[PDB]
UniProtKB/Swiss-Prot annotation, chain A:
Belongs to the ryanodine receptor (TC 1.A.3.1) family. RYR1 subfamily. Cytosolic calcium-activated calcium channel that mediates the release of Ca(2+) from the sarcoplasmic reticulum into the cytosol and thereby plays a key role in triggering muscle contraction following depolarization of T-tubules. Repeated very high-level exercise increases the open probability of the channel and leads to Ca(2+) leaking into the cytoplasm. Can also mediate the release of Ca(2+) from intracellular stores in neurons, and may thereby promote prolonged Ca(2+) signaling in the brain. Required for normal embryonic development of muscle fibers and skeletal muscle. It is found in: Sarcoplasmic reticulum membrane. This is Ryanodine receptor 1. It comes from Oryctolagus cuniculus. It comes from the Eukaryota. Coiled coil: none annotated. The N-terminus is blocked. Channel activity is modulated by phosphorylation. Binding of [3H]ryanodine indicates that the heterozygous channel is activated by Ca(2+) concentrations 4-fold lower than normal. Single-cell analysis of cotransfected cells shows a significantly increased resting cytoplasmic Ca(2+) level and a significantly reduced luminal Ca(2+) level. The chain holds residues 12 to 511 of 5037 of the full protein. Detected in skeletal muscle (at protein level). Fast- or slow-twitch skeletal muscle.
UniProtKB/Swiss-Prot annotation, chain B:
Belongs to the ryanodine receptor (TC 1.A.3.1) family. RYR1 subfamily. Binding of [3H]ryanodine indicates that the heterozygous channel is activated by Ca(2+) concentrations 4-fold lower than normal. Single-cell analysis of cotransfected cells shows a significantly increased resting cytoplasmic Ca(2+) level and a significantly reduced luminal Ca(2+) level. It is found in: Sarcoplasmic reticulum membrane. The chain holds residues 2273 to 2701 of 5037 of the full protein. This is Ryanodine receptor 1. Changing residue 124 to G: Impairs interaction with FKBP1A. It comes from Oryctolagus cuniculus.
Amino acid sequence: QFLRTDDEVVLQCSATVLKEQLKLCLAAEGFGNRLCFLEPTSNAQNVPPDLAICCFTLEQSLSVRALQEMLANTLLYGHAILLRHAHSRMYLSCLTTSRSMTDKLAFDVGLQEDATGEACWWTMHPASKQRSEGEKVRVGDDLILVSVSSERYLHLSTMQTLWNMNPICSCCEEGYVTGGHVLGHMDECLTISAADSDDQRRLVYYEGGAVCTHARSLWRLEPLRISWSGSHLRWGQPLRIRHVTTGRYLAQGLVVVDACKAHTKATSFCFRVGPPEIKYGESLCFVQHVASGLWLTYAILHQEGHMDDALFLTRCQQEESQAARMIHSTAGLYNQFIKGLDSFSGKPLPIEAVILSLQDLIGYFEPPSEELQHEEKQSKLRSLRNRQSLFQEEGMLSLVLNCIDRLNVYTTAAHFAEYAGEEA
Amino acid sequence: LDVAAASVIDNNELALALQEQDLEKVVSYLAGCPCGGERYLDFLRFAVFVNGESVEENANVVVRLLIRKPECFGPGLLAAIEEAIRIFYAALIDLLGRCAPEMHLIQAGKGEALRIRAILRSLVPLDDLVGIISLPLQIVPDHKASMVLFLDRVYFLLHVLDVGFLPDMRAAASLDTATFSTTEMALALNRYLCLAVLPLIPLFAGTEHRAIMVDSMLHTVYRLSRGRSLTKAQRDVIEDCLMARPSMLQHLLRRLVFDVPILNKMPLKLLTNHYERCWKYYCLPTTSEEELHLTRKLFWGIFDSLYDQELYRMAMP
Amino acid sequence: AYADIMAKSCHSFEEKEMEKQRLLYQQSRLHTRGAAEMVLQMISACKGETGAMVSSTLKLGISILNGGNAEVQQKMLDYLKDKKEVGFFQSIQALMQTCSVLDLNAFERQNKAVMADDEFTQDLFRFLQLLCEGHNNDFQNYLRTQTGNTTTINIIICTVDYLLRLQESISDFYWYYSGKDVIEEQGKRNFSKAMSVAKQVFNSLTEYIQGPCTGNQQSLAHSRLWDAVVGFLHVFAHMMMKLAQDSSQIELLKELLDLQKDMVVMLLSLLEGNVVNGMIARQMVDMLVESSSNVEMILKFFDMFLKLKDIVGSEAFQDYVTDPRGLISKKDFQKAMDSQKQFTGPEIQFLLSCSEADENEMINFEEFANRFQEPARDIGFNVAVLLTNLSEHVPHDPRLR
């Protein structure tokens, strides 16, 4: 159809892969690198596609002249288009730095921390034979996206390559429980393993306490549809659920193996009590999962359990969510680094990426400072203290110099110059 | 028919005036293009500009169309050199580079459209330097003149300067005497003229660089092409001297003293006198024995002689 | 040459009635002769060809009509029907196509230095408009696309498509002006020429849909063009702020104002009445809803012009800043306005800016009320009328309320 803008838009590219047509949605980690790598989404039953790595956000469009004027200071083909990755929060624009593989034209695509200037605007020639300038370039037909402060072109690797735009969220509605925020029950709202999935299969254990909120007590997912997974949730719509943190998927019976294998094994779960009727903090019925009459609460089965099944609905304030995603990426990297150190015995880029991630983390956890008025300071401190509190629970940062020790040991330094990979 | 293409060269209004559709058609023909195609492209570039400088609107359109269709010999310079060794096509590539250079923006930012300027810059590689290296390897000769021009248009200089100087000093040896009679150098001489303008623009390297200046003076005198161009090269040398440096002043000074003695042709003497005046200007505050000997030559020079005489007299003063 | 000669030849209540009779007489003589058939044939031959000769023929055709005259209209319709065509509409279409629109690159080249042609496009659109009028449900219906010809054409649809492009160019030009002090000049003249051509086209479009013919109106409405006028309406507002904002001054302002009035008239004309709640009405309401900010700005501007005038008229205001020979002094006018205590502060500063200083914060002012009150009075009325009618027809929806 036609998009006014101000609504997140997700783009998937395209053609066929390995003699098979395939669609990959562009996405980037952001922290630990702004480079975005397309992720294949071929089978839902086999695996659950991840919407976290592909964002959007449409805010500025007008026409080239307007853009120039602004720089000096319904989407229209063209006009000016701005994309926001919330996820990664920072905007994505063509990056001057040259690509590692090949040489001549193009550059790695990343979103600058600051959206200001010519570097980040792309640049849509809503071009199709049917399409013409001065059009309602609505959903469904590319069109060329060369920048802007370019140069060309995106990309295409893994000529002009056309990407087809998927409307991730049609519109925003309020309560409106929502497709994926994602947020009576004795406070003890449902919980996953506290600390780290020691069970590793996601054990309900159940919960109440600081643990709780508190940490690792959130879920989002839950697409049983590749696109337009927005508009609230229809009762018993049927969606998958992923526990936040190293949650993967949870639906050995109950509890979840890693999301791909785990998803196939427990291919999908639904809840039984576009227009939105679900109410946040309101309903929500009982669960369970379908594919077996089995009903959650207690816990698994019978299906049959005393009355209480009703699940109480959260809320999320987004900063916490961003923090969780960050903890997961940087944390994974730390784990990888530790593994690398272990691999190194040591018998007679990545680092690097870790260093960039570390710098970003330091920047985040940066102190509010005294510059703020008896106001900026008050606001920031509660927030910083809160972020610190949220992290303390996972505490890899802690895993931190724990590794630090491994590094000191290779010390002296590098015993001396490097167990392996010198420059390293 | 181009020729008919030429119909438009000197005029500025006509150039500003030409419609973009025609340019697009020409671009398309070029894209379809192939030595003939290269020639067509060169004609197109001349048409696109003409100087002084280049039309902003025309330049912009041309650059955009070119960026849009790539033609474009696959990609490099080394490959072209290899092809030259095997043997033209290299000439055509050079012409394209020259056209891009002529297309370069000026005088300076800002702004803007230096984007644009940046797209063009990315377009060059490593770059003007690679071109200089290619020129050194070549040291056809007329070819790559644009590359030299492009670097200036395109844009530590001494290090770059060192590579260029080696290629130069040579021409001078080959040029004088029989070689001077030989005309391959004359083609080379024209390039030399272009280089000097570029010339117009650690310490030990500079001093070695100082040797190159002496070599240049030797080329200037002489043998034997005009002349007016020679004068320009000479002014440049004079300008270089003004910019300059005691050691350089020195050995060059002795060679100059010998030249002065020989003089005591006429134009060379005038140039030497100008150089002496420059040295004097540089000498309020300012080997010494050598200078004294040179001066005695002047007293002697006055003696040797005994309007044009008046200018000679001013030089003597 | 002969065609031109013929056109030249064609060239107080009692006088008005007469003059009309005389014109009817010459045109009548030409009509009796079959000239209309000739014009149609010539137009058909062009076969989409673009040439002055085509232009000369168009001029001759405009000359033949002008002020209508039924024998001619009837004859033309009859001839077209008899010929069953032909692809005359095809040629007309090709021409509705290829009309020059203001282009920024061309303008820039001219500035660096004809171009931005041509007036003739205006003349062709004018002929198309002269065709409307009189009012032919049958004629309007044929204009829709006819029945006998194998093709048909969306004619009015085509004109609508063309208007959209013209608005885009005007918008681009305004964006380019940006507001770099102005008025630059030379260009202002080129712009005025462009504005004038567009006005004629707009009027013709209105006349075409002007007849209360259910089919033509319904068709245009479903079509696509809006939109279009929505965007034009938005640009118009910014241009309006700019003039007035400096002493460009009056001529440009007047030209800008006239075009807006014509647009308003066309909009009023489109509804042509309806159900208390009607699809057309809903669509109009929707467009208005879509644009709250632009409309709001225009309304605010009008109120400011009227409000200011009222204030000026007031005795208390005259009293606050006594002067030997006029002016409220910069301070001085600001303070009095503050005193009546009814204005946007940014708005107040803007008003001060609109006022023209004369070597020391001295303003004649009465002149200020007069200009721009006369032009406002002329346009403002049309706007109010449309708004009122719309409000009367569909309450609710409230947003409109």
